[PDB]
């Protein structure tokens, strides 16, 4: 009489990978993979999320807040997780900017990159005593106040010169100004207007040249006088003219240098930013919470160790991407049922 050892025969629909035996069939498997689905973004659990540079300086753009617009000036906190919702952000009024002639659009997206950001603790450069004639810090309607009046970006001073005269390039030397080992983001620009209005506000009616230097990087601009572009991302008709605006990143302890002429929107309130926040491209009504933010799939919480789908940047406690669905053999290699015995 025989008493033997044997293994089972069973339903083995799952196929697994094996180096020695090639692809084998198996009783059961524990899948390690999943294809998540596109859902909305949420609050990264262990850290803190952003998307609006400011919550309590409500009804604005991110860019508006970046530029230092009158009402859009809220004391804004930290994160260590940030969502990038507008790849090319827009302004919501104030004085008409010719956005596309500089890198200025991305200024919020740059700021977003830091943990700690702050409007200012002063303003860098005396707008009145600035090189070139004594200036009257121009202000403009088209940029209301808390009380109404005329506004001009806390960011920059609208240096309109009394003693109206043409000027050979003047140099300001925008100093560091900040606390700690923060960075400084200086913002500035130049106003230009039509032939007639140019002579009115400044004693010159020809293209004005502007050159900046910071961390070895030089930029050079030449103003436009006539036929400005069909006003957009503005409010209401100082349409005679426009502003070209640019930013300047000053690393800790370093000095910037703006050579300028007429229409110079000198810098004033300068950002100081520090730390590194983890940034990702998302969509921003941030509903509830997830474990891990995926650029595509979005708010998504970890179930299995690996995931299948579209690879993309993701932050937080994420499953790791994998080329193919992966299964862990939880059973026995398929054996046919046996009567091949005697």
């Amino acid at each position: 009489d025989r008493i033997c050892t044997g293994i089972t025969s069973s339903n083995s629909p799952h196929v697994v990978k094996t180096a020695t035996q090639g692809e084998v069939n198996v009783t059961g498997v524990i899948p390690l993979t999943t294809t998540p689905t596109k859902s909305h973004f949420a609050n990264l659990k262990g850290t803190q999320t952003r998307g609006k540079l400011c919550p309590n300086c409500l009804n604005c753009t991110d860019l508006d807040v970046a530029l230092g617009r009158p009402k859009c000036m809220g004391t804004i906190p930290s994160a260590k997780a940030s969502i990038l919702h507008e790849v090319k952000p827009v302004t919501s009024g104030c004085f008409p900017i010719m956005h596309d002639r500089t890198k200025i659009r991305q200024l919020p997206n740059l700021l977003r990159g830091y943990e700690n950001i702050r409007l200012s603790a002063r303003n860098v450069t005396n707008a009145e005593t600035a090189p070139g004639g004594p200036y009257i810090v121009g202000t403009s309607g088209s940029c209301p106040n808390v009380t109404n009046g005329n506004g001009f970006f806390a960011t920059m001073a609208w240096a309109v010169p009394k003693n109206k005269t043409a000027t050979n390039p003047l140099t300001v030397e925008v100093p560091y100004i900040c606390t700690k080992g923060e960075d400084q983001i200086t913002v500035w620009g130049f106003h230009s207007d039509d032939e007639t209005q140019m002579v009115k506000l400044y004693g010159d009616s020809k293209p004005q040249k502007f050159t900046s230097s910071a961390n070895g990087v030089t930029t050079h601009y030449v103003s436009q006088i006539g036929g400005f572009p069909n006003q957009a991302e503005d409010e209401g008709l100082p349409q005679s003219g426009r502003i070209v605006v640019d930013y300047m990143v000053q690393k800790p302890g370093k000095t910037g240098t703006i050579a300028y002429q007429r229409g110079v929107l000198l810098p004033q309130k300068v950002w100081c930013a520090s730390g590194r926040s983890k940034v990702i491209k998302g969509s921003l009504p941030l509903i509830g919470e997830a474990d891990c933010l995926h650029e595509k799939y979005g708010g998504l919480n970890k179930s299995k160790p690996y995931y299948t789908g579209e690879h993309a940047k993701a932050i937080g406690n994420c499953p790791i991407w994998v080329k193919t669905p992966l299964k862990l053999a939880n059973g026995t290699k398929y054996r046919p049922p046996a009567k091949l015995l005697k």
């Binding site: 009489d1 050892t5 044997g6 089972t8 069973s10 046996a338 091949l340």
Partner: peptide, 27 residues
């Protein structure tokens, strides 16, 4: 024996048993 024994509903591995009684199976 590369022989599955459908019938051991429980375990994956166990014992068979062969004689007058036929074939017994255990896990």
């Amino acid at each position: 024996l590369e022989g599955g024994w459908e019938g051991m509903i429980a375990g994956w591995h166990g014992y068979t048993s062969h004689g007058a009684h036929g074939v017994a199976v255990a896990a």
